Coordinates of C-alpha atoms in Angstrom, one line a residue:
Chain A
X8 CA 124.3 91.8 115.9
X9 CA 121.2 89.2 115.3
X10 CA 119.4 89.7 118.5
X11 CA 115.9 90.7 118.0
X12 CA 115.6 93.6 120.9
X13 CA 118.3 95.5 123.2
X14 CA 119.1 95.3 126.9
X15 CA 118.2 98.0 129.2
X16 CA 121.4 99.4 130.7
X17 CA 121.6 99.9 133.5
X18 CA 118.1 98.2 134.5
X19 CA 114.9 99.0 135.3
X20 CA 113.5 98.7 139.1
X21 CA 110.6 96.6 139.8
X22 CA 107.1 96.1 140.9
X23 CA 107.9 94.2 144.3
X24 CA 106.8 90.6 143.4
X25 CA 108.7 88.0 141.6
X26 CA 106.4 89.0 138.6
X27 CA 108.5 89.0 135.4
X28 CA 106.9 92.8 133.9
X29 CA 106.2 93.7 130.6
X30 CA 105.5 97.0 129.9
X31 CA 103.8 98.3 126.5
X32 CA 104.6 101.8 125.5
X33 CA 101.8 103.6 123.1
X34 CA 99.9 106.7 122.5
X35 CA 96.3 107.1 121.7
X36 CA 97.3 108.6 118.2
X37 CA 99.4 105.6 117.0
X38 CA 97.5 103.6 114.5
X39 CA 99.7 101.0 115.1
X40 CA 99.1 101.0 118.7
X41 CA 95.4 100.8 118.0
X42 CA 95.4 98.2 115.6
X43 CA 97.5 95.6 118.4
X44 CA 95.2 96.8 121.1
X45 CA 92.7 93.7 120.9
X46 CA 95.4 91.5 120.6
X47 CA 97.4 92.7 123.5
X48 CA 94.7 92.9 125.6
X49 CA 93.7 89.0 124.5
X50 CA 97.9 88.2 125.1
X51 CA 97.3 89.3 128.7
X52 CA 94.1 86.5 129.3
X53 CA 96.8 83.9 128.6
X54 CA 100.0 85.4 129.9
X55 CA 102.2 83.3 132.3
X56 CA 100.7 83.0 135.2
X57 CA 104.2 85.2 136.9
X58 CA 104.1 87.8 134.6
X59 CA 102.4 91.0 134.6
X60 CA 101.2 93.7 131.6
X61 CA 101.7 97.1 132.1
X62 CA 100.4 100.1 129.6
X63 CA 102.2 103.1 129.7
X64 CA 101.5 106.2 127.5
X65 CA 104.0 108.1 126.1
X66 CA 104.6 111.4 124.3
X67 CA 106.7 112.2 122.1
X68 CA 106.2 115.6 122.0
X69 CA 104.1 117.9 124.0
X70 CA 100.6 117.5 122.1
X71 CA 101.0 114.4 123.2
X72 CA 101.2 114.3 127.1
X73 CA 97.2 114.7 127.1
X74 CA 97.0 111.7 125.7
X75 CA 99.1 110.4 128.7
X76 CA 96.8 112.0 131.2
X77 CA 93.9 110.7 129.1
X78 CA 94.8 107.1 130.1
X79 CA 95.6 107.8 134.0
X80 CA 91.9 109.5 134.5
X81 CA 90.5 106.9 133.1
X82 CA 92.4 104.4 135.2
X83 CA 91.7 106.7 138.4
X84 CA 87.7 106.8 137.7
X85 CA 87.9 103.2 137.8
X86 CA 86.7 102.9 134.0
X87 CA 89.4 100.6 132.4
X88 CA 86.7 99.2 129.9
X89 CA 87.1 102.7 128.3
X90 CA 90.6 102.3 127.4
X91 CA 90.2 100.7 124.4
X92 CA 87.0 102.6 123.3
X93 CA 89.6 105.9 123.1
X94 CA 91.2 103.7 120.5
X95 CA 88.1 103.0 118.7
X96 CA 86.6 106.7 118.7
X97 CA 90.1 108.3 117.6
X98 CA 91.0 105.4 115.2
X99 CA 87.8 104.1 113.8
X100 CA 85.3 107.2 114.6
X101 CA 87.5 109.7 113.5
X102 CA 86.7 111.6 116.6
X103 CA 89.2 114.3 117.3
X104 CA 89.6 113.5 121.0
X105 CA 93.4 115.4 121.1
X106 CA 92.7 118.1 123.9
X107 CA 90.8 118.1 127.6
X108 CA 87.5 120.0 126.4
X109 CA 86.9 117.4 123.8
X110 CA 88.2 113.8 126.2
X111 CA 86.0 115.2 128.7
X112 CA 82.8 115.8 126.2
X113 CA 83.5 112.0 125.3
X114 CA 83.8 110.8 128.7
X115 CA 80.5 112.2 129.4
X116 CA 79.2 110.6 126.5
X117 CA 80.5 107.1 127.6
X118 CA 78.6 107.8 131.4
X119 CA 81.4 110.0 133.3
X120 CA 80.2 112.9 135.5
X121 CA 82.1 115.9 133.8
X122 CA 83.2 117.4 137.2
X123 CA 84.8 114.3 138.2
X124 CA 86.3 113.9 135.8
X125 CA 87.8 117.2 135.2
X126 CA 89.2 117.5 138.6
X127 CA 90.7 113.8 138.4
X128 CA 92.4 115.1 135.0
X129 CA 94.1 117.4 136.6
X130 CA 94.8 115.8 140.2
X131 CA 98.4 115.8 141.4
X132 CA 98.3 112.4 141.6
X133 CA 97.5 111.8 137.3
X134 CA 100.2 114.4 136.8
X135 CA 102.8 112.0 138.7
X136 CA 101.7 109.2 137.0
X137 CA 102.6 110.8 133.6
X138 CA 106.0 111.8 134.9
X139 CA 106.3 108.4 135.9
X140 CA 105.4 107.5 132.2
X141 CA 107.7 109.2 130.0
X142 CA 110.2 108.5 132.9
X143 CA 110.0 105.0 132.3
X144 CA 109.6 105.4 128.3
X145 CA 113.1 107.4 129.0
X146 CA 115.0 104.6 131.0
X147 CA 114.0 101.9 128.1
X148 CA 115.3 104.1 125.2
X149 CA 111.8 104.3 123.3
X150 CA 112.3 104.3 119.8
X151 CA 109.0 105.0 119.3
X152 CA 105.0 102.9 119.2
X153 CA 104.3 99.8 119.9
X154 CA 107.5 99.7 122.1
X155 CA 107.4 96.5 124.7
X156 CA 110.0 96.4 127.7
X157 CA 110.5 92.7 129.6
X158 CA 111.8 92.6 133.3
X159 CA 113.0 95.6 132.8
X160 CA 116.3 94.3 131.2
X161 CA 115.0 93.6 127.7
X162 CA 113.2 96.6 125.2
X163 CA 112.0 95.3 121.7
X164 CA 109.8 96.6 119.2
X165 CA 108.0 95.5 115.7
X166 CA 111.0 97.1 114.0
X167 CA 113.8 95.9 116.1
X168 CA 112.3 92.2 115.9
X169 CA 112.2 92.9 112.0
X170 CA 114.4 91.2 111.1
X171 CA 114.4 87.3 112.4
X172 CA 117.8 85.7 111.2
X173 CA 117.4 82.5 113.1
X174 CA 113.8 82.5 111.9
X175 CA 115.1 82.5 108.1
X176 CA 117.4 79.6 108.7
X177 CA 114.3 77.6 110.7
X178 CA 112.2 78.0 107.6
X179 CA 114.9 77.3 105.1
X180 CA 115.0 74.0 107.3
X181 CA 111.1 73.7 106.7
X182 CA 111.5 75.0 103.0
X183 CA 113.9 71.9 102.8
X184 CA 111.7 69.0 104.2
X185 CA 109.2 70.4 101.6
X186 CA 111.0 70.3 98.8
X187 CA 112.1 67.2 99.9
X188 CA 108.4 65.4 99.4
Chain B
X7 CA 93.5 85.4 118.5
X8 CA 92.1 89.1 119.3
X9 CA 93.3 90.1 115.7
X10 CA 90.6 92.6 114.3
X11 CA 91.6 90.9 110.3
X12 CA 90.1 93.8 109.1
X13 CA 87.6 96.4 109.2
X14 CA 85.0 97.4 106.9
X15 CA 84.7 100.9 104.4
X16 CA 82.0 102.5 104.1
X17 CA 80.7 104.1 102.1
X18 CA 82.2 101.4 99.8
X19 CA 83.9 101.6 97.0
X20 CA 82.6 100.8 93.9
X21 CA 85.0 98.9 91.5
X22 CA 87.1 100.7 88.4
X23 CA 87.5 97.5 86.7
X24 CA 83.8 96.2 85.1
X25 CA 83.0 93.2 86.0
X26 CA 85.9 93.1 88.5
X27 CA 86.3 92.7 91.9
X28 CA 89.5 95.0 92.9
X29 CA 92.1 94.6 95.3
X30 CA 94.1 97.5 95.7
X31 CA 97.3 97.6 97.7
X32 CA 98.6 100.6 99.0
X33 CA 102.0 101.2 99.4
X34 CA 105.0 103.7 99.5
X35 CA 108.5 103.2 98.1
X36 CA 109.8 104.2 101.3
X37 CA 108.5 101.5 102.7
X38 CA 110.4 98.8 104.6
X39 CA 107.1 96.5 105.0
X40 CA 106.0 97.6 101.5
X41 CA 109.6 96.4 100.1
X42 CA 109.3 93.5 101.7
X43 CA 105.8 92.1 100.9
X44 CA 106.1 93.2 97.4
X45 CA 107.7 89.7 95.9
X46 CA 105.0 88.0 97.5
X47 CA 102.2 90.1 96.3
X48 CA 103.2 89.7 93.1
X49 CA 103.4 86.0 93.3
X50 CA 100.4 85.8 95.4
X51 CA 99.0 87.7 91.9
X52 CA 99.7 85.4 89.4
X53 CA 97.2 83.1 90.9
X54 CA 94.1 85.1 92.0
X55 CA 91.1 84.9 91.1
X56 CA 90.2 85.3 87.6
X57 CA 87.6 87.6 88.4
X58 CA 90.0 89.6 90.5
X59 CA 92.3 92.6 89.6
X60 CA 95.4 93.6 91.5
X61 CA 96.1 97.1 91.3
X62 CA 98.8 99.0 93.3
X63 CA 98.2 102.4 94.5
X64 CA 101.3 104.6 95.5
X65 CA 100.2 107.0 98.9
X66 CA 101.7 109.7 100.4
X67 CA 101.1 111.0 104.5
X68 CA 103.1 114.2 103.5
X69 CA 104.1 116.0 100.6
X70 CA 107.5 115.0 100.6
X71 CA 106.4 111.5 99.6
X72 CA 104.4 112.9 96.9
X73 CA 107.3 112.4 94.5
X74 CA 107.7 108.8 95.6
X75 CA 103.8 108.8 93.8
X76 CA 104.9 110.6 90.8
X77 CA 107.0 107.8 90.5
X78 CA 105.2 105.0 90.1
X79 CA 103.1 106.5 87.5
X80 CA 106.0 107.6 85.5
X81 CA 107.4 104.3 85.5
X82 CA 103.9 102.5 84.2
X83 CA 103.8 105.7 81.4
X84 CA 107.1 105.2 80.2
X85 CA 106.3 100.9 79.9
X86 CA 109.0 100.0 82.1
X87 CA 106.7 98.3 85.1
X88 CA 110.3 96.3 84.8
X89 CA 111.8 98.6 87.1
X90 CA 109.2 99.3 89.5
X91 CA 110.1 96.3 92.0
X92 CA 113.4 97.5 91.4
X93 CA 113.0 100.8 93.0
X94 CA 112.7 99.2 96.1
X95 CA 115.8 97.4 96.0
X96 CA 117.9 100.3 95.3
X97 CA 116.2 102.4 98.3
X98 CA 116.2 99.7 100.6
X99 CA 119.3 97.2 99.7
X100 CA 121.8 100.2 97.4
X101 CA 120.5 102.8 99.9
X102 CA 119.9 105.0 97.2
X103 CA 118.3 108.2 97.8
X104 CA 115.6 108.3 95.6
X105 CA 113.2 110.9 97.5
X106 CA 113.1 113.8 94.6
X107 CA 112.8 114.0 91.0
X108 CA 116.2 114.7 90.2
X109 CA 117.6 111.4 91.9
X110 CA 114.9 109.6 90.6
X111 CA 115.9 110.7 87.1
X112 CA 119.5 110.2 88.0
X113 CA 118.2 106.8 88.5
X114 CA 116.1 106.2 85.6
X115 CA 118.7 106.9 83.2
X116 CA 121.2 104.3 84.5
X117 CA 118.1 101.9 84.4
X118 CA 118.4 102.5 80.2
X119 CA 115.3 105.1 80.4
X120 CA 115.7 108.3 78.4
X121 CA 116.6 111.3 81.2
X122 CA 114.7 113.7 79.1
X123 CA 111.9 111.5 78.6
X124 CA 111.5 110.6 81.9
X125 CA 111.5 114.0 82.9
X126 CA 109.1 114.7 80.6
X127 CA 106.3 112.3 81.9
X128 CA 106.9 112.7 85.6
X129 CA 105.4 116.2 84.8
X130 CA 102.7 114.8 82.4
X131 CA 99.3 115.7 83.3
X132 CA 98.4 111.8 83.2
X133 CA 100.7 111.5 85.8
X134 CA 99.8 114.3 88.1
X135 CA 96.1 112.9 87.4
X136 CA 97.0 109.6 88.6
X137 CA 98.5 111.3 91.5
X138 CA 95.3 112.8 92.9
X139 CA 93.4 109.9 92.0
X140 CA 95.8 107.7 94.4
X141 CA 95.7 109.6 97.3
X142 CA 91.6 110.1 96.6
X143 CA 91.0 106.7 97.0
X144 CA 93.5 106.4 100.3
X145 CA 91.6 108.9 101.7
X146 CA 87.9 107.0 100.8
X147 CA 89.5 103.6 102.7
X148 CA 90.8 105.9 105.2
X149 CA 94.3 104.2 104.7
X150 CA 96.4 105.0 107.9
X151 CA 99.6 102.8 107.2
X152 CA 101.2 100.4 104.7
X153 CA 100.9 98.2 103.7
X154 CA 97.3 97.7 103.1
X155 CA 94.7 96.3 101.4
X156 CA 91.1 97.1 100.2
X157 CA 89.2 94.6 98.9
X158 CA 85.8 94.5 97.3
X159 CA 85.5 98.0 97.9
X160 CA 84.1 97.2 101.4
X161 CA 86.9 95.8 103.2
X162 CA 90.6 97.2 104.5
X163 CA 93.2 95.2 105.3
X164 CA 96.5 94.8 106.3
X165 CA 99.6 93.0 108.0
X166 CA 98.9 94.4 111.6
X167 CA 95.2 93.9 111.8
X168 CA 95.5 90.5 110.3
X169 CA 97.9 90.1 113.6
X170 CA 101.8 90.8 111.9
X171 CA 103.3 91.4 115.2
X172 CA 102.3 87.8 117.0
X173 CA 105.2 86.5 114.2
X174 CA 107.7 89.5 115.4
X175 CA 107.5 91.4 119.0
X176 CA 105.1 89.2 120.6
X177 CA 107.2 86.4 119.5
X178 CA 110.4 88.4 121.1
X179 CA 108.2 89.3 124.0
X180 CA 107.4 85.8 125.0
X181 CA 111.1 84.4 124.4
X182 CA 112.1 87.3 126.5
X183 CA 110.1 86.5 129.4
X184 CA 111.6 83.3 129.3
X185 CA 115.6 84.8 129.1
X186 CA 114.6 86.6 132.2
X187 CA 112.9 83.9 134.0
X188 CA 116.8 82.2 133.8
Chain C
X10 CA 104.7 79.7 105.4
X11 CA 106.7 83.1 104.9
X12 CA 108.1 82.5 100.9
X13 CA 107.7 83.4 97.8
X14 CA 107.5 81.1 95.1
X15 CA 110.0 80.7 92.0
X16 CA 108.4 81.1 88.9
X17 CA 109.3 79.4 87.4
X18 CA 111.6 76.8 89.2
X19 CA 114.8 76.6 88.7
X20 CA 116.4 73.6 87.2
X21 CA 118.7 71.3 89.4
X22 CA 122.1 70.9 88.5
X23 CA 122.5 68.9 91.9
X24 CA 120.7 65.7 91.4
X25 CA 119.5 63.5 94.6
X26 CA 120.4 66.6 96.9
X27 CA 118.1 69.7 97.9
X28 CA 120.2 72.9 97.4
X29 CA 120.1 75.8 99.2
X30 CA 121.5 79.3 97.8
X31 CA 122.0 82.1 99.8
X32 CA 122.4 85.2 98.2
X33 CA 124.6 88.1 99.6
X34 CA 126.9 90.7 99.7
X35 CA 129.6 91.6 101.3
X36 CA 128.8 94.9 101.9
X37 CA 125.4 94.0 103.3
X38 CA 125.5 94.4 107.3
X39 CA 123.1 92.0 107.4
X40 CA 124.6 89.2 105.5
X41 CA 127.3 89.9 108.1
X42 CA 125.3 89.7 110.6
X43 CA 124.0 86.1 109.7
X44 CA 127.7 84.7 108.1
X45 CA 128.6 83.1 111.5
X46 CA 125.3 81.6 111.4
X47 CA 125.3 80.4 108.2
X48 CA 128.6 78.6 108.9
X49 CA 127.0 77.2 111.8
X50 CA 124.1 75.8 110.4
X51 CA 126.0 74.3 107.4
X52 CA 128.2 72.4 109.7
X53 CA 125.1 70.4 110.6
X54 CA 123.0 70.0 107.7
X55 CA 121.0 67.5 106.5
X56 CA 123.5 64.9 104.8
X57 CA 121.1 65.1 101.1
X58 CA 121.4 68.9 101.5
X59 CA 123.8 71.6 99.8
X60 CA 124.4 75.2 100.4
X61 CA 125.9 77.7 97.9
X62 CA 126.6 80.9 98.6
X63 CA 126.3 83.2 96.1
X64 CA 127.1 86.9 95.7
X65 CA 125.3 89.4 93.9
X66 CA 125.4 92.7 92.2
X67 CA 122.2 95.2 92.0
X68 CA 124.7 98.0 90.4
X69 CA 128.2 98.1 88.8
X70 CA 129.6 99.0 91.8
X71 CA 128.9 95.4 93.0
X72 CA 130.7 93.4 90.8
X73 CA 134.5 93.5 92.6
X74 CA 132.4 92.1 95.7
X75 CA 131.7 89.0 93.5
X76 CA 135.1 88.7 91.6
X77 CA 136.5 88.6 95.6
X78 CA 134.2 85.9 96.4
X79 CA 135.3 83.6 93.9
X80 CA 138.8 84.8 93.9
X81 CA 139.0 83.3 97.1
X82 CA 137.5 80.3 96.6
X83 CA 139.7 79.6 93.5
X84 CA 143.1 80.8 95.6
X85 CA 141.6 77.8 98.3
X86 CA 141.2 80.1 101.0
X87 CA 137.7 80.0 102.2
X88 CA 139.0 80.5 106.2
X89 CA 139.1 84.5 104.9
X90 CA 135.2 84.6 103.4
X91 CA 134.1 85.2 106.6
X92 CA 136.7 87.4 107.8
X93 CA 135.8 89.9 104.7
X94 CA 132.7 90.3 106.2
X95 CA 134.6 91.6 109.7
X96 CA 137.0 93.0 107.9
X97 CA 134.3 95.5 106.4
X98 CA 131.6 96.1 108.8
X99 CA 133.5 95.5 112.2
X100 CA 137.0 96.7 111.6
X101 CA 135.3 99.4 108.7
X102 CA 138.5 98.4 106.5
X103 CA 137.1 99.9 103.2
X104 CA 137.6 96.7 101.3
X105 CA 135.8 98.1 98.0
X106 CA 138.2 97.7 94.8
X107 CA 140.7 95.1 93.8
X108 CA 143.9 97.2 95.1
X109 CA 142.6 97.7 98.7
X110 CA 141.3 93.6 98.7
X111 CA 144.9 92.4 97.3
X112 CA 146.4 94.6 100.0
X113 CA 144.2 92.9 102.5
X114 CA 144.5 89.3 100.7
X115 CA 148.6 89.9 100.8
X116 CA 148.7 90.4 104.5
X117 CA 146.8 87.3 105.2
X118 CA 149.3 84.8 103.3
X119 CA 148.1 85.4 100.0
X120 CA 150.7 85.3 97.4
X121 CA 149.6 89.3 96.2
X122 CA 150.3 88.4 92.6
X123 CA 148.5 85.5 92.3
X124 CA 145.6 87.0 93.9
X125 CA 145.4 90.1 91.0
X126 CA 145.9 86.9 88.2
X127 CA 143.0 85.1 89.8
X128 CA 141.1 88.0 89.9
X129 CA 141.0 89.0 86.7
X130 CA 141.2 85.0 85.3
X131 CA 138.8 84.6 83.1
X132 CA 137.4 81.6 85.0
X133 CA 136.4 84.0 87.7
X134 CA 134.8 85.8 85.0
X135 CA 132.7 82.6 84.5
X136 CA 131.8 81.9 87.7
X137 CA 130.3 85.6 88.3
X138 CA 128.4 85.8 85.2
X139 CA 126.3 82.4 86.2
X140 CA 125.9 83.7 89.9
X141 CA 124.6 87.2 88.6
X142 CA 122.5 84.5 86.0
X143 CA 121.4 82.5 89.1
X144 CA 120.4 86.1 90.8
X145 CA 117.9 87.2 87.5
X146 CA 116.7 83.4 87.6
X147 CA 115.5 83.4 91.1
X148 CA 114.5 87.2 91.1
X149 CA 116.2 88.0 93.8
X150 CA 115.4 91.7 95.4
X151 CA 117.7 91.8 98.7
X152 CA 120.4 90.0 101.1
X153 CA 120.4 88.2 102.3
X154 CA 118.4 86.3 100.7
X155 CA 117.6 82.3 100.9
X156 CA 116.1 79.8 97.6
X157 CA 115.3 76.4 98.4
X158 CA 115.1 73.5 96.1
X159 CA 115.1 75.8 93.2
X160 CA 111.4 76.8 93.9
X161 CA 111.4 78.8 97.2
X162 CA 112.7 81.8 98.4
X163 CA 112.2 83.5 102.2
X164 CA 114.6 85.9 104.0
X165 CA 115.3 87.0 107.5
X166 CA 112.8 89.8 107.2
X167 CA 109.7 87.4 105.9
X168 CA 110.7 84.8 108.5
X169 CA 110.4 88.2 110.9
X170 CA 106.9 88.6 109.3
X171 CA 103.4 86.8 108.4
X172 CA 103.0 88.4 105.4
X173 CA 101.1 85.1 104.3
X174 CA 98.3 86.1 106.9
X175 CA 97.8 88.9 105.9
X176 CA 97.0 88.0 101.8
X177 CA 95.2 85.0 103.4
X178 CA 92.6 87.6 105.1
X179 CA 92.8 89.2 101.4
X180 CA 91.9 85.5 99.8
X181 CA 88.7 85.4 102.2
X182 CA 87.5 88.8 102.0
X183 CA 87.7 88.3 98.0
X184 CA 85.1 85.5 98.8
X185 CA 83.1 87.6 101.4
X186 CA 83.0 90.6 99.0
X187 CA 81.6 88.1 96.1
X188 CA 78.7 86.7 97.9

C-alpha cells in the first residue's frame, strides 16, 4: 500500500451541486489545527473554481463537543471573521476558552450580545449541526486533527500523506540531474 | 502563502552560550517528525553560522516521556552523543521499545555502554538537573509540538507554521480533487 | 530540496554513470511497499544511471536478511527478490533464518543445497560486509532509504515533507535575531 490517503467506504452523500467537497475536520484545541488555519483559509481564495471547503469540528471526547458548538454559534450569529480569532485566543493568548461561561465572556469581548448568544449556543438547531459533525467525522473514519475528506470518497491526513513514495523516486530523479552537473 | 513562519516569544530568551546566538530544537525520541528531521539538522549544523550554537533540547507533554528526557542526557554524560541519532532508528526503524529505563538500559548495553554505568547516570543529579532545565525552557517558548525551533531567544519555529503540510495533505488534497473530478 | 547531504561524499566506483543506492530491508513494510516501484522506475532510467540495492542491518538480527539478498543474486535468481518481500509482509511467511529461507528457496526451484553453500560462501560474506560498509559510509538511519551520486540522500518520508522550509525560516530568523 503506497497511496497517500484511504477511500471512504461506502461514500459520503453530497451537497447538491456538482461541487467536488472538501471537508476539514479540527478542534479548537489542536495546535496543529491552529497552526494550518491561515493557510487553509488562504487555500480556499484560490481553490478550484467547482470545489467547495467545509470546516467541521469534531470531538474526540466529550470536553470536546463545546468546542463543536463553539464554531456553529459563531457561524449562526453571522460572525465567521471570529473563527479564526478562537484559534488565536486559545493558541497564542493562552486564553482558557474550554467551557460556555468563558466562550460567551469572549464573545462579548469581541462585540457579541451575551443573550444572543447564549440562546443561539444552545438552540436546537446548533445542537443538530454538531450531531451532524461528529456524524460526518464518523462516516470518514477520523484518525484524528487536521483530518481532510475529498468528494466524500477520499480521507487523508498529515500522517497518512507521510509518507510520499512516488515523491522519493521524483527527487531521486532531481537528485540525479544534479549530480549530473 | 498564508504560512504564519513563525511567531515571536516573549519575554525572550536570553542566550546560555556568551556571545552566542542559540538555536535550540526541541524534540522527543518518540517522535516520527523528530526522527526524521534529525539527519538534516545535523547536516544543516555543520554549516551554521559561526556565531550560532545548535543545541537540542529533549521535551516531554506527559510524564511518561520524561524518561525519553533522562535519556538524552544520560547519553551526552556517558560521551556516547554516538548513539543518540541512533536511538531513533531503533524506536522508529527496529521498533524497539525504548519508553522506560530498564529497556533503555537493555539497550545501552548492547550499544557497548556499561549496564551499571548507565544506570548509574540516568539517576545522576546532573541528569535530573538537565531534565528540569529542558522542560523549563519548553515551557518559556511555550513549545506545543515537535519539532521546533527557538531562535535568538525571540522567535519559535517549526515545520507546520513554516507551512509542512502544503508538501503532504494539501498536496494529497489537491491531487484528490482531481481523482474525483475523473 | 528534501536531502541531506553526504559528508563526506562517497567515492565512485562507477565512473561516467550517476549511481543510485537504495537501502532496505526485507523486513521493512515500507521497502515492500515501494519494491514494485523500484522495479518500475529502474526499467526506465536514465541510460548514464545505475541503481543498487543494498540491504542493511541496524542489529544482529539483520544480518540473514542481507546474506538472502546476495544469496540470491549469486544463485542468479533475482525473479525471487521481490517475491521475499510478498512472501513476508503479504503472505506473513516468517522468512527470518536461513532454514525457513532455504525451505522457501527449495520450493521455488532452488537447488536447497546449493542455496545453504551460497549462503554461507564466503563471497557472500564479502559482499555483506561492503554493503553494511556502504551503510556506515552514507549514514544511513532508515528504509528505505535513497543516496544519489554518492553525495545525497532523501527518503519517502522527506519527499513527504519540507523539512528544508522549515530550517530555511531558522536561517532568516538567525539573521532577524542578529540585527
Amino acid at each position: 500500500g503506497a497511496q497517500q490517503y484511504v477511500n471512504i467506504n461506502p461514500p459520503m452523500p453530497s451537497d447538491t451541486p456538482g461541487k467536488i467537497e472538501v471537508l476539514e475536520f479540527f478542534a479548537y484545541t489542536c495546535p496543529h489545527c491552529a497552526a494550518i488555519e491561515p493557510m487553509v483559509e488562504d487555500w480556499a481564495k484560490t481553490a478550484p473554481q467547482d470545489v467547495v471547503l467545509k470546516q467541521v469540528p469534531i470531538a474526540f471526547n466529550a470536553g470536546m463537543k463545546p468546542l463543536q458548538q463553539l464554531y456553529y454559534t459563531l457561524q449562526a450569529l453571522e460572525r465567521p471573521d471570529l473563527h479564526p480569532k478562537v484559534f488565536t485566543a486559545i493558541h497564542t493568548e493562552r486564553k482558557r476558552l474550554f467551557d460556555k461561561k468563558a466562550m460567551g465572556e469572549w464573545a462579548a469581548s469581541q462585540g457579541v450580545d451575551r443573550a444572543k448568544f447564549d440562546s443561539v449556543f444552545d438552540s436546537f438547531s446548533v445542537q443538530t449541526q454538531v450531531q451532524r459533525a461528529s456524524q460526518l467525522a464518523e462516516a470518514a473514519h477520523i484518525d484524528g486533527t487536521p483530518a481532510f475528506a475529498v468528494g466524500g470518497r477520499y480521507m487523508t491526513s498529515p500522517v497518512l500523506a507521510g509518507n510520499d513514495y512516488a515523491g522519493a523516486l521524483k527527487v531521486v530523479d532531481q537528485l540525479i540531474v544534479q549530480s549530473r552537473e
